Design a protein around this nucleic acid. Structure first.
Ligand SMILES: [Mg+2]
Ligand SMILES: [Mg+2]
Ligand SMILES: [Mg+2]
Ligand SMILES: [Mg+2]
Ligand SMILES: [Mg+2]
Ligand SMILES: [Mg+2]
Ligand SMILES: [Mg+2]
Ligand SMILES: [Mg+2]
Ligand SMILES: [Mg+2]
Ligand SMILES: [Mg+2]
Ligand SMILES: [Mg+2]
Ligand SMILES: [Mg+2]
Ligand SMILES: [Mg+2]
Ligand SMILES: [Mg+2]
Ligand SMILES: [Mg+2]
Ligand SMILES: [Mg+2]
Ligand SMILES: [Mg+2]
Ligand SMILES: [Mg+2]
Ligand SMILES: [Mg+2]
Ligand SMILES: [Mg+2]
Ligand SMILES: [Mg+2]
Ligand SMILES: [Mg+2]
Ligand SMILES: [Mg+2]
Ligand SMILES: [Mg+2]
Ligand SMILES: [Mg+2]
Ligand SMILES: [Mg+2]
Ligand SMILES: [Mg+2]
Ligand SMILES: [Mg+2]
Ligand SMILES: [Mg+2]
Ligand SMILES: [Mg+2]
Ligand SMILES: [Mg+2]
Ligand SMILES: [Mg+2]
Ligand SMILES: [Mg+2]
Ligand SMILES: [Mg+2]
Ligand SMILES: [Mg+2]
Ligand SMILES: [Mg+2]
Ligand SMILES: [Mg+2]
Ligand SMILES: [Mg+2]
Ligand SMILES: [Mg+2]
Ligand SMILES: [Mg+2]
Ligand SMILES: [Mg+2]
Ligand SMILES: [Mg+2]
Ligand SMILES: [Mg+2]
Ligand SMILES: [Mg+2]
Ligand SMILES: [Mg+2]
Ligand SMILES: [Mg+2]
Ligand SMILES: [Mg+2]
Ligand SMILES: [Mg+2]
Ligand SMILES: [Mg+2]
Ligand SMILES: [Mg+2]
Ligand SMILES: [Mg+2]
Ligand SMILES: [Mg+2]
Lengths: 169, 145, 159, 296, 211
RNA sequence: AAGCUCGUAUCAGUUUUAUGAGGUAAAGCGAAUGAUUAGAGGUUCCGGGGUCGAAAUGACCUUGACCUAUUCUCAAACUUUAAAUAUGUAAGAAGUCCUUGUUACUUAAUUGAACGUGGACAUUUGAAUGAAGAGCUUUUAGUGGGCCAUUUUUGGUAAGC
RNA sequence: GAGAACAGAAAUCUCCAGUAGAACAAAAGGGUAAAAGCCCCCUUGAUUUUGAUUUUCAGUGUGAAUACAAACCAUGAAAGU
RNA sequence: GGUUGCGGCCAUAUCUACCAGAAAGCACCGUUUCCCGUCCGAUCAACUGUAGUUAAGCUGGUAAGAGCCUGACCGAGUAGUGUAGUGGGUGACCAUACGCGAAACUCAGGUGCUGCAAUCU
């Protein structure tokens, strides 16, 4: 069937994985701020690596989750950079999909040598209405298969609106 | 050892009557290795009492030999003679407990014929002497009384 | 060298019962104890506060005191050639009302009954318990039931 | 599920299922344990909870006690009763919360006898106050907020229902710091504001502010307030009279009903699908081995 | 330096396995327990003959290993190496200690010394499957192996089909029915339990009635 | 040793009945943990070899690891199950039931809780067997190297260890 | 497990599964899932008085512990703890 | 009989896969002025009950389903065990006598019951 198992984007999560803390990071953060409007969250390393030059709890990366029309304006905006082609991987079995771009300048955004050039991970997670079942406090349940988000359902979703290509086999 | 006391068998070859219920049957079970028992006939209850029967009177242990001795003590419950005694026993009467406790443990001699077996301390069923030997109890006791 | 701490040796005895871990069900707490009640004692490993020492596991005493969250239980423990009295402070999670007396209570209320049902009719009381009695005579029949003759059976090996 | 997921003989076997009302995500037992148990030396004394729950817009207030056979409703009151008292709209708002609790307090505290003594604050200026014990007299009826799974936020409406009960006569011990108009950064309540909610000042002021800023929305919602010609200002008297109505006669009218219980059992069993018999299932298998194995 | 087996014949101790509590123990001298044509199907080898203990004792790793070879050697040079399937039915899990040796009897808890299987009465030590047309050859294999073992053991012809749990006619009934199906060297049987669907998937050749 | 207070009273290295507690023996391992023999069927952008290759997130063998349903074998310091023997309490007059006083505890509450006053039912009054009675107090000796047998059992190859 | 630029066996982002297979200073064993674990908020009940009780036992001491009474506090909307 | 709120026992209530659900309820669901919380009004807070929907939740039913529960002279009076003997055997061990008595197995049968209050063609 189909009445209101639409395919709304649950949220968009931009991720900048820097190998390091300090100045370089706090600038990568600035990028996600002025790009999201929201004020971005930092992530500490989970263990030391020494060949990645990182210590446990260092503040290694920043990222931000954006929802509602705001997310569309950006997905679209990077989808552009990615010339509207993704790949049959890229889409998870549980529905969602993501991509990256080197150089954030390719989505509006000027240059300015006070900031530099950063890479960015785009991760789009999808769902339908009645999602709140899994997420709310009382009577926390689980969405039925006839309503869970699949791979096919999202690729064809994606293939339709945007009019973008999927590719590979 | 406790049980042999409770059944008033504290000397070899002595004997006492036991009314059978679950709650005494288990007592018997506990002491099979030490006793010989079975179902006594009228004949042998009669001659146990006539010959070797004694009452407990302010302790003491008093030969029966006159009927007034009984009526004196057991008479309260009916029972005013030596045959009255016997009758209360064999029929397990309403007053068997007093009737029977009144009787001092019988004190038998060793069997006369002998024990019939070369070793006493296995079960009757294995050619020994101990345990329930059922109605063959009379042949034995009669040779011991 | 040796070890004899408070809960030594209690590995499986304060253990929790297969598939019965977690919260204690609430009825344990809606129970109500009064002085004089007979309780059974059995430790709940999950409730560390107010726990009977292992010696009192499996034992049945009498309430002597009632408190916000506990009952005081007196148990006679026997040391040497004699008993002494012990009072135990137990949380309600380690106690339950004993059925050790339900029989009695059942038997008394019943016994007072058939005493009236007798007396006020013309007696034939008869209300002491008697032991299992031996079986009376009986006649077993054959109609539809002729005896089948069995013998012992030869040695064999299945293998 | 996917094949490398799904479960085993062993997994399912050793599985310890939780209490039903946890599997249902309805009962927090860690709180029930502490809401319900009594001092062992207060013996068979019940420990009554004021249970407040919010459905997608119905408000429930039951005064409940506990029994190992199951709990027990002393009295109950639903905000959907408020039409009886002059409240037809906005039945899940904060002042519907207060009102309903008011009803619940009166209702029981009536049928208990403590009706005339222990009235509570008749006034209502949102001053902070519990109902005190009257000098040589019955101690009041004591009660404990069973919030359920509500989050305690300073402003939440669960605490509004609390206000109305503690305003109506009940003894329900409570602090101020979750009532709207409690100041975060000064340990001090503004009764200006809390009186406002009790009477619905936030919904009123929202209405007047939507009047001349945006009539697109003001009609989408606040529809019913048009259809019945209640414009803002009167929202107080609405609830002010609701208060009086309630106190005046709270004695719970049940529904007129129509159709017997027997009757509701008729047309419902029409949709209650029925189990099968082994004889029947035996023949659904035999049938299947005839079909799928009998080589078409 | 190996003590005489006489010293550990009897089952005097409680099982001392190799474990975290033990830890430093010699490897079992016997390390293969399935030789001959193990790969072979259930149908290939109907006759089963056992070497069976008549004692409550202990058998060394070394006497399992040495016996293992004795039977296997005879079996294969007389009847062929694919001509049978020997299965050692007994794993030596119990560790034997020794008080190597200053001190005297003071603190005397031994080091591991070697391994043993603990064996019951009627406990099978060796199990072997062939063609009936080989009985003698195999029984000789087991007969010679005995000489390698302390304590009475006695050879016994099984009623069972190979290493199967069904007896010959009962195995045949089930098979010449349809409900049996080859696995590795063993076999699967159709059960009337469970999904109907994937129960017909498996075992297609049932669900006719016959053949 | 001295007794003392009582006396069918109360008493018990025993059974029965009713209600508990226990994780040993056995058992189990196609049940968890841990071990252990064998194959069979799967899965790879994902350990390595290797033929085709310009490569491939290529195909094809191959050996491994894992997964599936199976297979032989084990546990003092493993276990779902779970004995036997031992083991707690109870089987009344200090009992059961009714009427309704006391309080500063406790209840929303003359509500409860505890202790009571008044009233109703005697020995088949509440299983068995036994009871040369039961209870109680003071004071003091010797002893504080132990050894042996059946069964359980630890160390040791073993021992008249 | 399946997904995302640099990014690899291991960095950070997301979703699914997940009876606990983790974590709770430490030996090990018990115990624990809207917690007893992890993040945050507020704190000093790690306080004052003097008795009873359990283990070890002589039913002495010591250690450690339990349930109350009489205070003063903490936290929480609250039952409470 | 349905449903909701609060429950008791805590799998016959769980798990996997399908399909069916009237009416009410519950639910999903719209909103961001206000209390309130967030990197994100997803959660959490408030407002509307108006604009929308049975798709999910929920309830039930199907399955030689997995699990779980119950039964039985199914296995088995088997294993183990208290008691006995100047019983057998070099021993290891093993029979017998008077009692108690499992677990796996196998087969059959089930797959939540129920308390308080409100509500419903
Ligand atoms: Mg629809
Ligand atoms: Mg770096
Ligand atoms: Mg007698
Ligand atoms: Mg003669
Ligand atoms: Mg002579
Ligand atoms: Mg002669
Ligand atoms: Mg002789
Ligand atoms: Mg003579
Ligand atoms: Mg030790
Ligand atoms: Mg503590
Ligand atoms: Mg799996
Ligand atoms: Mg299985
Ligand atoms: Mg749990
Ligand atoms: Mg809480
Ligand atoms: Mg032994
Ligand atoms: Mg030894
Ligand atoms: Mg030495
Ligand atoms: Mg020396
Ligand atoms: Mg050492
Ligand atoms: Mg074994
Ligand atoms: Mg030999
Ligand atoms: Mg143990
Ligand atoms: Mg064992
Ligand atoms: Mg088992
Ligand atoms: Mg295992
Ligand atoms: Mg098998
Ligand atoms: Mg064990
Ligand atoms: Mg006893
Ligand atoms: Mg007497
Ligand atoms: Mg006397
Ligand atoms: Mg002395
Ligand atoms: Mg002395
Ligand atoms: Mg001395
Ligand atoms: Mg001796
Ligand atoms: Mg630990
Ligand atoms: Mg909780
Ligand atoms: Mg300190
Ligand atoms: Mg002390
Ligand atoms: Mg001292
Ligand atoms: Mg002390
Ligand atoms: Mg210490
Ligand atoms: Mg509807
Ligand atoms: Mg805002
Ligand atoms: Mg929303
Ligand atoms: Mg909310
Ligand atoms: Mg549907
Ligand atoms: Mg629900
Ligand atoms: Mg099934
Ligand atoms: Mg045997
Ligand atoms: Mg035995
Ligand atoms: Mg002897
Ligand atoms: Mg012997």
């Amino acid at each position: 069937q189909n009445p209101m198992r639409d395919l709304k984007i649950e949220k968009l999560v931009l991720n900048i994985s820097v190998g390091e803390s300090g100045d370089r990071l706090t600038r990568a953060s600035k990028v996600l701020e002025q790009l999201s409007g929201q004020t971005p969250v930092q992530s500490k390393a989970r263990y030391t690596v020494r060949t990645f030059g990182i210590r446990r709890n260092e503040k290694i990366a920043v990222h931000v989750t954006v929802r509602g029309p705001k997310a569309e304006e950006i997905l679209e905006r990077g989808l552009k950079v990615k010339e509207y082609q993704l790949r049959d991987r890229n889409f998870s079995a549980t529905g969602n999909f993501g991509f990256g771009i080197d150089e954030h300048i390719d989505l509006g955004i000027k240059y300015d040598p006070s900031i530099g050039i950063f890479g960015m991970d785009f991760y789009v997670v999808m769902n339908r209405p009645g999602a709140r079942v899994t997420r709310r406090k009382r009577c926390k349940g689980t969405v039925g298969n006839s309503h869970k988000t699949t791979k096919e359902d999202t690729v064809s979703w994606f293939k339709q609106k945007y009019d973008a290509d999927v590719l590979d086999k | 050892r406790k049980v042999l006391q409770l059944l008033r068998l504290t000397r070899i070859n002595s004997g006492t009557f036991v009314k059978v219920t679950k709650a005494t049957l288990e007592l018997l079970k506990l002491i099979e290795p030490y006793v010989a028992y079975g179902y006594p006939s009228y004949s042998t209850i009669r001659q146990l009492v006539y010959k070797r029967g004694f009452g407990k009177i302010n302790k003491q242990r008093v030969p029966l030999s006159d009927n007034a001795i009984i009526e004196a003590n057991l008479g309260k419950y009916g029972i005013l003679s030596i045959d009255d005694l016997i009758h209360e026993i064999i029929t397990v009467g309403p007053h068997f407990k007093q009737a029977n406790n009144f009787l001092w443990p019988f004190k038998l001699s060793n069997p006369s014929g002998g024990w019939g077996v070369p070793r006493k301390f296995k079960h009757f069923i294995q050619g020994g002497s101990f345990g329930n030997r059922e109605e063959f109890i009379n042949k034995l006791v009669k040779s011991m009384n | 060298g040796k070890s004899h701490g408070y809960r030594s040796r209690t590995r499986y005895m304060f253990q929790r019962d297969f598939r019965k871990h977690g919260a204690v069900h609430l009825s344990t707490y809606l129970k109500v104890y009064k002085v004089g009640d007979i309780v059974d004692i059995k430790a709940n490993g999950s409730i560390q506060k107010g726990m009977p020492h292992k010696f009192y596991q499996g034992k049945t005493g009498v309430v002597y005191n009632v408190t916000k969250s506990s009952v005081g239980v007196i148990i006679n423990k026997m040391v040497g050639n004699r008993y002494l009295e012990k009072r135990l402070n137990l949380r309600v999670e380690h106690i339950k009302h004993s059925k050790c007396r339900q029989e009695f209570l059942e038997r008394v209320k019943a016994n007072a009954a058939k005493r009236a049902e007798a007396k006020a009719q013309g007696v034939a009381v008869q209300l002491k318990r008697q032991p299992a009695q031996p079986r009376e005579s009986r006649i077993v029949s054959t109609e539809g039931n002729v005896p089948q003759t069995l013998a012992p059976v030869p040695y064999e090996t299945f293998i | 599920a996917f094949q490398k997921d799904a479960k085993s003989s062993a997994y399912s076997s050793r599985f310890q299922t939780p209490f039903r009302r946890r599997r249902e995500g309805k009962t927090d037992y860690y709180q029930r344990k502490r809401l319900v148990t009594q001092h062992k030396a207060k013996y068979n004394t019940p420990k009554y909870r004021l249970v407040v729950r919010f459905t997608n817009k119905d408000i429930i207030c039951q005064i409940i006690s506990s029994t190992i056979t199951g709990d027990v409703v002393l009295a109950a009151a639903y905000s959907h009763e408020l039409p009886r008292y002059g409240i037809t709209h906005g039945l899940t708002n904060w002042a519907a919360a207060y009102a309903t609790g008011l009803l619940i307090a009166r209702r029981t505290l009536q049928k208990l006898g403590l009706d005339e003594t222990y009235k509570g604050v008749e006034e209502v200026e949102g001053e902070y106050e519990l109902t005190e014990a009257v000098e040589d007299g019955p101690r009041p009826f004591k009660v404990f907020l069973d919030i359920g799974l509500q989050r305690t936020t300073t402003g939440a409406r669960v605490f509004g229902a609390l206000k109305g009960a503690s305003d109506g006569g009940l003894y329900v011990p409570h602090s101020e710091n979750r009532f709207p108009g409690w100041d975060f950064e000064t340990e001090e309540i503004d009764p200006e504001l809390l009186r406002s909610y009790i009477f619905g000042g936030h919904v009123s002021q929202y209405m007047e502010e939507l009047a001349d800023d945006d009539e697109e929305r003001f009609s989408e919602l606040f529809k019913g307030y048009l259809a019945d010609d209640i414009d803002a200002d009167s929202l107080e008297d609405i609830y002010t009279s609701a208060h009086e109505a309630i106190r005046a006669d709270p004695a719970f009218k049940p529904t007129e009903k129509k159709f017997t219980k027997e009757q509701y059992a008729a047309e419902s069993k029409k949709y209650r699908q029925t189990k099968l018999s082994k004889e029947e299932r035996a023949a659904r298998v035999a049938a299947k081995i005839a079909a799928l194995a009998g080589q078409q | 330096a190996r003590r005489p087996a006489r010293c550990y014949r009897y089952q005097k101790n409680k099982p001392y396995p190799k474990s975290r509590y033990n830890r430093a123990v010699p490897d079992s001298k016997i390390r293969i327990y399935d030789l001959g044509k193990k790969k072979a199907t259930v149908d290939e080898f109907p006759l089963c003959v056992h070497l069976v203990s008549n004692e409550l004792e202990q058998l060394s790793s070394e006497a399992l290993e040495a016996a293992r070879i004795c039977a296997n050697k005879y079996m294969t040079t007389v009847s062929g190496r694919d001509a049978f399937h020997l299965r050692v039915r007994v794993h030596p899990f119990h560790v034997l200690r020794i008080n190597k040796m200053q001190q005297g009897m003071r603190g005397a808890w031994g080091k591991p010394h070697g391994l043993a299987a603990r064996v019951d009465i009627g406990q099978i030590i060796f199990s072997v499957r062939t063609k009936d047309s080989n009985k003698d050859v195999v029984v000789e294999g087991l007969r010679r192996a005995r000489y390698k073992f302390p304590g009475q053991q006695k050879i016994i012809l099984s009623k069972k089909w190979g290493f199967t749990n069904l007896d010959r006619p009962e195995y045949l009934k089930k098979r010449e029915a349809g409900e049996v199906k080859d696995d590795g060297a063993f076999v699967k049987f159709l059960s009337k339990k469970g999904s109907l669907e994937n129960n017909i998937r498996e075992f297609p050749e049932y669900f006719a009635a016959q053949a």
